[PDB]
């Protein structure tokens, strides 16, 4: 790997610089190099990893959606034939997206998840696993689509089971996991009622536990709770 010669600490330092410079591809490459050193990641380091790849794939997803919409319009009655170029370029973007998702999944499988024993680390990685299978599912149209969707579901479910046993209802990781799994239900699994029920119960259970928190923890939890509320408002 091209980062093999760079110190772990220098990779982390450079990932933080890359973030400041909004150079998210570089940030992701640095954090991939840091993961591949083989040591477990701290909380801060897990956050750098997640932010880098979230931003890289987020941009790919937005571009894929623009291209897929143009491609759909091209297949409507009365649309002039323009050749294979729209499909080819959507395929190009799609293949690069799938590559990034496979790279993240590969870091999680080799060997972040298996070394993560604390609930906060293990839930965080399993959530990432669900998220990157969800991004694969968004673009899947073949023989494996069902298996891809099930992979996402299984990862999210294991994370949920741990989170409910080991974390308080206000814990930001528990909250973020639930937010995303609720979106999975709505957008991927064709289960809007499940999505709504999960978002509502998560919100309500968190609300009831806010009284136990410091001001700073309250801020963290309520920020994510508002995203649950935002989704519920969109869906109801």
């Amino acid at each position: 790997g091209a980062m093999g010669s760079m110190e772990r600490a220098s990779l982390i330092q450079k990932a933080k610089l890359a973030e400041q410079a909004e150079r998210y591809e570089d940030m992701a490459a640095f954090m991939k190099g840091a993961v591949e050193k083989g040591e477990e990641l701290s909380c801060e380091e897990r956050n750098l990893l997640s932010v880098a790849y979230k931003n890289v794939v987020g941009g790919q997803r937005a571009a894929w959606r623009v291209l897929s919409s143009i491609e759909q319009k091209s297949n409507e009655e009365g649309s002039e034939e323009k050749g294979p170029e729209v499909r080819e370029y959507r395929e190009k973007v799609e293949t690069e997206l799938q590559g990034v998702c496979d790279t993240v999944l590969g870091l999680l499988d080799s060997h972040l998840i298996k070394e993560a024993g604390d609930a906060e680390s293990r839930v965080f990685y399993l959530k990432m696993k669900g998220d990157y299978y969800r991004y694969l599912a968004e673009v899947a149209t073949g023989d494996d689509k069902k298996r891809i969707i099930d992979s996402a579901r299984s990862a999210y479910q294991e994370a949920m089971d741990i989170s409910k046993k080991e974390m308080p209802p206000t814990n930001p990781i528990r909250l973020g996991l639930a937010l995303n799994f609720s979106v999975f239900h709505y957008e991927i699994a064709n289960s809007p009622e499940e999505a709504i029920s999960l978002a509502k119960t998560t919100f309500d259970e968190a609300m009831a536990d806010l009284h136990t928190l410091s001001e700073d923890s309250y801020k963290d939890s309520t920020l994510i709770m508002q995203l649950l509320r935002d989704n519920l408002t969109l869906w109801t």
Binding site: G176, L179, N180, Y186, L227, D230, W235
Partner: peptide, 5 residues
């Protein structure tokens, strides 16, 4: 699109 984190 709905919110995710």
């Amino acid at each position: 699109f709905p919110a995710t984190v």
